[PDB]
Design a protein around this ligand. Structure first.
Ligand SMILES: [Mg+2]
Ligand SMILES: [Mg+2]
Ligand SMILES: [Mg+2]
Ligand SMILES: [Mg+2]
Ligand SMILES: [Mg+2]
Ligand SMILES: [Mg+2]
Ligand SMILES: [Mg+2]
Ligand SMILES: [Mg+2]
Ligand SMILES: [Mg+2]
Ligand SMILES: [Mg+2]
Ligand SMILES: [Mg+2]
Ligand SMILES: [Mg+2]
Ligand SMILES: [Mg+2]
Ligand SMILES: [Mg+2]
Ligand SMILES: [Mg+2]
Ligand SMILES: [Mg+2]
Ligand SMILES: [Mg+2]
Ligand SMILES: [Mg+2]
Ligand SMILES: [Mg+2]
Length: 67
RNA sequence: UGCCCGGUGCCGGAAGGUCAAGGGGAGGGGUGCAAGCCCCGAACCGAAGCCCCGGUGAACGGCGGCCGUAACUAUAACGGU
């Protein structure tokens, strides 16, 4: 049960697939789940980020809530 | 038909260590008035065997443990001791 679960979360698609992509050219920290793109790589890939997960947490309520 | 000759066996080894009878007689003892007679007795010389030095497995025989490490977990080619 620990290998059936973990194999899904990591995803063999570690070439380029699921969650986020971090631009170091122009600094576009993007999460393809929703869309929200921003330049906070300096403030995120060098510190905390508890507020930029909020839309991923808020858009995931209205995902479940509205249906 | 692999690897191990440290132990055992067998094989080789005029060195060395130990080694019995025998040789040797520094020195000591018994007795006799005595010449003497008799008895212990160190050094040193003195084999095989053993020690020792090597060889030998289709001679007797013996051919490990622990720990970590790789693209999901597993496993561990790899490392450490
Ligand atoms: Mg071998
Ligand atoms: Mg042997
Ligand atoms: Mg032998
Ligand atoms: Mg040897
Ligand atoms: Mg034996
Ligand atoms: Mg011999
Ligand atoms: Mg000799
Ligand atoms: Mg003698
Ligand atoms: Mg004599
Ligand atoms: Mg004699
Ligand atoms: Mg004398
Ligand atoms: Mg006397
Ligand atoms: Mg006298
Ligand atoms: Mg001899
Ligand atoms: Mg054999
Ligand atoms: Mg042979
Ligand atoms: Mg045998
Ligand atoms: Mg043996
Ligand atoms: Mg591992």
């Amino acid at each position: 049960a620990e290998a059936s679960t973990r194999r899904n979360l990591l995803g063999s698609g570690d070439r380029s697939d699921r969650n986020r992509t971090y631009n170091f050219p122009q600094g576009r920290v993007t999460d393809h789940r929703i869309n929200l793109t921003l330049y906070r790589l300096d403030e995120v890939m060098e510190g905390k980020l508890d507020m930029l997960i909020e839309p991923i947490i808020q858009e995931h309520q209205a995902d479940q809530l509205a249906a």
